[model samples]
Target: NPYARGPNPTAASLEASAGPFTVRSFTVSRPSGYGAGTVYYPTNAGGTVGAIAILPGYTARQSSIKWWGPRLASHGFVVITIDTNSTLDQPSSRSSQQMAALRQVASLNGTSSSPIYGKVDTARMGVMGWSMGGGGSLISAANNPSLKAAAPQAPWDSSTNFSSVTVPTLIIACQNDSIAPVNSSALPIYDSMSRNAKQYLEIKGGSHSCANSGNSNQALIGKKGVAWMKRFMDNDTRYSTFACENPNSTEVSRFRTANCS
Candidate 1:
């Protein structure tokens, strides 16, 4: 597979630099399912690699969370940052759109004339997003246990009964997010998850967009997010320490996990 079979650049080093392969990106317009977005992938040789689809929050566009595309794709995953059918889409609607993006990429993998043909590991998939998008990520996880993993940043959901989500998960919370208060949204969502591999990271004094662009704690977010996804999505145990260990930094105000490493 084209995924990172890593040992040299451990999980702790996920944000160090881009992988050996060159990165390529493009815009995709899906007529059906109202899917549209940008796809970022590695140009390295491999039969296939894992895929992660991301969604933006309410009234937000891909630009709000587009950093993830290059950040994760450079580490050996195909990342799609999407625009919802409507800017006001709810978490449930956002989740479906995110999955639709994944399906579109899978279709591209089968097209003979496509550049990324045969380069996506459709079976190994994951989802993520911000605000309602983050809530949608958890919804997708609960609805689809076969998904490799999920990491929702300051998610805002109407429900927190994700007790059935078996997929490995990481909840990135902002300490002072007024929009999706950590106490109500992220904390409850994380508590509902029964998986031993789940994790919670609350950024210190962060706002709703703490993990978004121009955040002061970009390094910590990058390291933790990539590590969580790699440890589960890619099944790379090399990130065990990075994922399981309690990283000591003032940037993270709160952290929790179970059965890691």
Candidate 2:
């Protein structure tokens, strides 16, 4: 598959010439699901592309987590940023809704009347989110082991024993996140996760919103986030070093990896 054949461009060095595809955006809602969301995809990626669904935190909407749409889409993935029906939902609730969003995207890919027809590879998929939604993403990964990747930022969950999860994951930790303390939340979750392909990146002085919009460390966060998906979601080995190497940037306070090679 062309989607799998890649000397894929490094997300860290993305520029005007990264890929031939031009990013496009739109909105979608599912009657059976609990939320609505925005979808982003490349106009011309030469072939079908993998996808990922992202949900925002409690009391937040797509605006808080939508930046990831363009960032990941530009790197060759169909990105969806969903808004839960009720922002008060817990991690489990968010997980179900997030999967609903993915289901809708997969449907769109098959709907002959939709613009995304024949453009999406539902077989290659992933999930991501912020805060409680991030926790939900971990839940999604645990439940859906076939997902290509999972990257949660400042995850806050009631339970952290994610040892049953087998999906490749990249946990984005915030050093100064009072909302979801790294020690109690992100750390334990990453620690319990037994996947061979797993990573943890603690951003120096970063709050709970370190990987979201209005963040100062977008350059680095986006780099790692996109690289993680490209390496795992696409199974593109070209991104292995970029995804596995310890990014000793001043912004990244700490880094850890397993089965990177």
Candidate 3:
């Protein structure tokens, strides 16, 4: 029962039955000039986290990504899910702000004042985003050199500039997504990251929100997303075995394409 703490207890638990691990709620300073919002972190007392920052899509709230926070925490990661004002109307500006905030978080974590300072393995940090947030993730990852990995789910195609992204990245595209054309948004990015480690997934009948919540598609993307994070962030060879040795299986097959070379 090492991981089986009380419902929503503040302590860290790594037991499988207790459910991976859970992150305690914590606040992070918003970048100057941007509006205020809350950020959540999954903490561990003994485990060293290769930090991950979640950037949510437009009109999406930080609470919406809570489903993923504890899931990643259970995997012994320090997850930071952020909320940005990237709605449909002001897409470009919101995207910029989101990237700025992401950089701010990285800078703060690198500083001594950061609670995660010295605790997070900065070399292993990555980023994940949903919807418009996904687009921002791609843009940020493409531009920023600090990110080691980038995962964008159902990203929008305001501009097709994914070629600049040299980091290992993943694109989770939903089959039924109409808002962001999978071929235009995800495929192009996947194809453009030819020089870097890139992977793409097209969930059958998956929708725009499939990576978030609702339906079986959601569960499918969520499980894969977590697995992908663990494989890259924690360097777990078991997941790599699952991905490489059994590439045709249900889990690996869901990914339409994967290029780690």
Candidate 4:
């Protein structure tokens, strides 16, 4: 299914730098019983590598997430953003579909003839999602061992399954989110994570879409979130610099924190 509306002018701007850094767009044969979607791959070209799969919120298209794709590419990550069947205003099914899509991506990467064949470092994979997709990221990451890290923004919880997640996680909650109450979604997820490497950032006055957009909070969250993923994925000790212990060290502290495990 075509989840993105259309290419935006802003997304076009990324083609320049993000392109030269090993980015490619191609179709993947959907596994039986699942719908199809396109995948974007940004590679480090045999250099030290990390990969991220971006899942958008309900009703959000793949193109809407392209802006961050290149930014992450520039940061030396091979990013993949998939088109999911995110039905608007329906949180439960949206979460399920996004999770299904994530599983498909993982399966494809493991297959031989897949587009990402031998291109991605399966050991260094992560997931980043928005709103319902964020919630889906948590649910999917919980069951998928390949996902070493995760970042979820403005997540909604039809089911509070955050405690099941075993990967290092970063939760970005928007204070003004109407879809997922910050207190109910992000706070609870942070507290419930079983992983000792979890972190949370609550952007005051920011909306649910802030992390995806060019807004100041989005920029802040994106920078921190991407950095955290890199540290864990690459096995860089520097990744700990942004750990939960340094909550007040980064500018991101403007956002609040709850149960930080």
Candidate 5:
């Protein structure tokens, strides 16, 4: 595909800490509707790359999801890890700020002085977040069906009726999470999306923080996150097997995929 970049995929390559591209970052001098953000991009992706906006959960800051910046950017994407307008902001507010971040990134592409000028593919974008922020991701997908992908970890919201969402989504759940447990939150949200490519992965014996920053299961989590974005955002078939396969490892407590193959 014209959007595809990087070499062919391999289990070891996707599981590595970084991908083929060298990553660089910059602080958004004047963040738009969001509070603050750090933008990470590949120095030489050979072509424009898709943009992904990530938000932190309730009472969390950018640090909670910062690791995804370098990890995804090195894999040929423009990733922004953001702080919400307020730490107490709910999911709908987070969704608005997430879209605002993506809009600002698009505007930066036209400003010659910006670090990411001409480096991002504005038409292709994605969303991600932690708990409440993860719920925001689903809301974003529901409202903006044009988005290429979404991958939220331990998502939480007041309700679970995301049946309107058609954008590809991957919900990462933490098996032992006391907050936003799978049965009531993540799994139900995943099941609600009936008309799209989706996957649900629950990390074995994990807490609410398992898929957030500082978790030790990067080998599987990183691989799946990168593969899902590549598969949907870039339309790269090279990642189809990696993205749709069950993984079947003991590290995963539950795995289910539909319409992804």
Candidate 6:
């Protein structure tokens, strides 16, 4: 694939804390529409990479999901993890801010003086988040069908229907989550995506923040998230098995995929 980067992926390489590319990050001096952001990118990913915007959950800051920035960036993506304008912003508000962050990242890519200038392919992008921000990720996908991918964990939303979303999505569910139970929130949302590729991964015994920063299952969760983006956003078929096949590990209680092979 023209957009593929790094070496061919392996199970071990995908599950590692960092991938082949060395990573560097810079905080956005004047964040647009969002409260603040940290842009993480690979110093030498061999070529330009896609951009992704990740948001924190309700009552959460960038610290809740900052880990994804370096993790995905090192694997060949320009990742931005942002803090919402308000700690209590809802899904719609967070979605707007998520797109705004992406817009700013695209703006930075064109500014000659910026660090990420010419390092990003503005045409390719993805969205992600946690809790309410996870819901925002879905809303962003539903509203912007052109998005390449969407992966959200323990997502909580006021509504369950996301039938309008056509973007390839991976919903990471926490089996024991109380805030956004698998049956009501994540599962239905995954089921609603009938027009595009999708996957559902449930972490056994995980709580609402199972996939958040400091989670012990990074080896598995991180692997799946990165693989999903690579398979869809970058259109790299090299990740087909890693993104579609179930790991069948003790950490995963349930797994399902469709239109991914």
What's each prediction's TM-score? 0.94, 0.94, 0.76, 0.74, 0.99, 0.99
Sort the candidates on TM-score, descending order.
5, 6, 2, 1, 3, 4
Taking the tens digit of each residue's C-alpha lDDT, what string does model 2 give over 2-104? 5563345655364232444578887774434867878898887767889899989999999998878888887778988988989899989999998988888
TM-score, prediction 2: 0.94
What is the model-wide C-alpha lDDT for candidate 4?
0.61
lDDT preference between candidates 1 and 2, better one: 2
Please name the candidate that would achieve the greatest TM-score relative to the true structure: 5
| Model 6 error, position 227 (Å) | 0.5
Candidate 6: TM-score?
0.99
* Per-model lDDT: 0.84, 0.85, 0.60, 0.61, 0.95, 0.94
Q: How many residue pairs clash in each candidate?
A: 0, 0, 5, 0, 0, 0
- Best-to-worst ranking by lDDT: 5, 6, 2, 1, 4, 3
- lDDT tens digits, residue span 1-261, model 4: 111111221222322333235566666565332234556665444453556767677777666566666666655566666666434634445445555555566666677877666555545677777877787678767767567778878877677657767787888877777778777777777778765477778776767776775556444555566556655666554444443443442334344332332
Residue 178's lDDT within candidate 1 is 99
Candidate 6 structure quality by residue, lDDT tens digits, 1-261: 889999999999999999999999999999999999999999999999999999899899999998999999999999999999999999999999999999999999999988899999999999999989999999999999889999998988899888888899999999999988999998998887888899999999999999999999999999999999999989999999999998878999889888888
Number of the top lDDT candidate: 5
For residues 129-248, write the lDDT of model 5, one tens digit per residue.
999999999899999999999999999998898999899999999999999999999999999988999999999999999988889998899999999999999999999999999997
Q: Which candidate model has the greater TM-score, 3 or 6?
A: 6
